[PDB]
Symmetry: C3
Subunit: 285 residues, 3 copies
């Protein structure tokens, strides 16, 4: 099928922690991360980018699910301009998308990143998930204008979905979000490491990855991994099943990253919200 | 089968180099790394942690081989307290274990780490090994109380099994340990990267990894790798066979790590000690 | 078959950017990277190293394709000396070679590195490539004599084949080289991360890796990867096919690396040079 996707490059204030501290973000659609894009393998994506008239910078769009021309297709457009391009999603899995404007380190760091999920055309290629969650790791830099600090990898926090300990109510009493599932259910994590710079060594504390799929591709399946290494600009699908009620903590096991905000708690309970990890709730905002 | 495993959280002085320099370590059973734990896939482990009465800190236990509740099972216990929990080793391979107390970065860095080996139930899943060796990489931090330096990744050394160049008699004439095998023998390395922060790019100088198993699982086999990337908090099983007498040097190929202590020499000779890499000698102390 | 390979350890000035800035390099055969060595699986390599009489340092040779003795075979030789050793290339793929002299961090960083390609004995193990290109990543350090800066990972640039933005005429107007292919052709990238310290997260902007082979081995094939992580001292074979005319940009997706020089443009055109990526032109100098 043919799907139409329109995103707006918007420069606006967004929250980055649980106390409501704000940041001068650059975004797709006024939020960090950008909207989840979801298509089926083989679908035609008609993409439109609108750079908001109030933006002070040129912006662009790069989909890792696209096979196109970097020069013409991923070109930067000025505030007030609109760009269109079309691509087929040739490969199933999970893919990073981000602004490709100069310099990419800053456009990514300021929040212009998201995920495109490409469901396999074969519905039985992956085992059936009972829950799905999107987690996108990124480094947070204190001064969004300081490109030197970014080049030197001097981040202040490492976060999931734009927030320091956004999903950790165990550590942070001010955290208001967490992942939910029932014991025995297959929880599918769509993970993207946006970077811009750092690696992620993703581990579920008190659990194990049942299956891991590099780039989300069913052909690359690995089994029963305690940890999985996701480079900057890479993505994977990771399945998790708890045999008991309680919690796991999804962490970047590079402890300095974890202690800086990269911990997401999943609660396994018999009374899990039936709407959690389903429909529009896969990226918890 | 059901086995019983008791470990003691002990805060004590241990040596970290070949000239007998000491460190105020936090340990399992007064040694770094902790005792090797070894079970068969499917086994029930009845675990007991005793926090020594002389400890000044709360401690805990996290097994990557366990599927439990992070909140209740991996909880911290005070000096003088005893905690018990039970888990089944559901998956074969090699798994990181460590203290999960606040902050994990420091508890790991000070020496509270080890390995649990889970032998496959199918005795023919892995090719028969003639030697087995445990190698655990960690960063050594000069001041064990300086949590800031740990957060900033300012380590002094990168070590195998708690010692700077512990297994490198070629470079350090004061080194008294090395790995042993005969030419043609299959040497199985159980490798754990304890971190807390850094990645390991493991390479046998003058050799090649015959086979590598991510998380030690037979299902994930990769062949003839010159190097293998092990993230912080990850583990793998790596097989090595030398066709000749001589030496290989197992290194973290990120050279700054290798030069800071991450080199382990394996000697291939016809007169190799029949006790080496067998029974109780797999982690050479 | 038996092949004879002679390399000279030569200390000489080489260019490292597009304005002809020079560096006091340590090299094999007066160039960075060293000459491409290419053999067939099972071949016998009779290797000779000649340390140039005017060298001020001892040098050596370490092939990741060799299974030998680090002590005797990879030993350092003085200026004016000649060393010989023989090895069989037992495993097919792509392998790092470098000087193994003290300290390796500096010998690698100053330019003593290259690639050995070992073609599979089974000519149908890999799909047929229409183009082949060698790309070797390394960190460039401003002061070649400053070993502390190297140990602290304080590089100035991250480069492909010894040059800052060597293959990026889109960004740098002074760049005179780029990769070439026609749409629909299978482009095979032989990639080596020489380091000495850093990891590479390799991604083709506006493309996807059709196939990736860890250590270039056909047995380890992975499919449709947006990115692939190559540790320091590791190598991989990565296949790329563009369905359209235009360009892809091969980048280390850790953005601070890319912005510091790690970007190589491949141009897909109907009028691509029939000599490009073939015969003697696989490593573009
Ligand atoms: Cu932008
Ligand atoms: Cu990207
Ligand atoms: Cu502890
Ligand atoms: Cu852990
Ligand atoms: Cu040298
Ligand atoms: Cu090497």
């Amino acid at each position: 099928k043919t799907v139409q996707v329109t995103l707006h490059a918007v420069e606006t204030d967004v929250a980055y922690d649980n106390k409501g501290s704000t940041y001068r973000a650059w975004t797709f659609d006024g939020k960090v991360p950008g909207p989840v894009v979801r298509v089926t393998e083989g679908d035609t994506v008609e993409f439109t980018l609108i750079n908001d008239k109030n933006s002070k910078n040129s912006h662009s769009m790069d989909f890792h699910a696209a096979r196109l021309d970097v020069v013409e297709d991923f070109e930067s457009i000025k505030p007030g301009e609109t760009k269109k391009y079309t691509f087929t999603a040739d490969n199933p899995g999970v893919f990073f998308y981000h602004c490709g404007s100069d310099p990419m380190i800053q456009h990514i760091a300021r929040g212009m990143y998201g995920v495109i999920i490409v469901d396999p055309k074969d519905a039985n290629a992956l085992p059936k998930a009972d829950r799905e969650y999107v987690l996108i790791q990124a480094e947070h830099y204190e001064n969004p204008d300081d490109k030197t600090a970014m080049m030197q990898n001097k981040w202040s926090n490492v976060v999931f979905n734009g927030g320091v300990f956004k999903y950790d109510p165990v550590h942070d009493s001010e955290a208001t979000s967490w992942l939910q599932a029932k014991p025995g259910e297959r929880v599918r994590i769509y993970f993207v490491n946006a970077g811009p710079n750092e690696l992620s060594s993703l581990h579920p504390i008190a659990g194990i990855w049942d299956r891991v799929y590099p780039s989300g591709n069913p052909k690359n399946v690995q089994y029963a991994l305690q940890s999985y290494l996701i480079g900057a600009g890479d993505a994977a699908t990771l399945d998790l099943i708890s045999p008991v009620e309680g919690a796991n903590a999804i962490v970047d096991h590079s402890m300095r990253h974890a202690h800086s905000g990269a911990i997401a708690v999943i609660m396994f309970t018999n009374d899990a919200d039936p709407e959690a990890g389903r429909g529009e709730n896969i990226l918890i905002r």
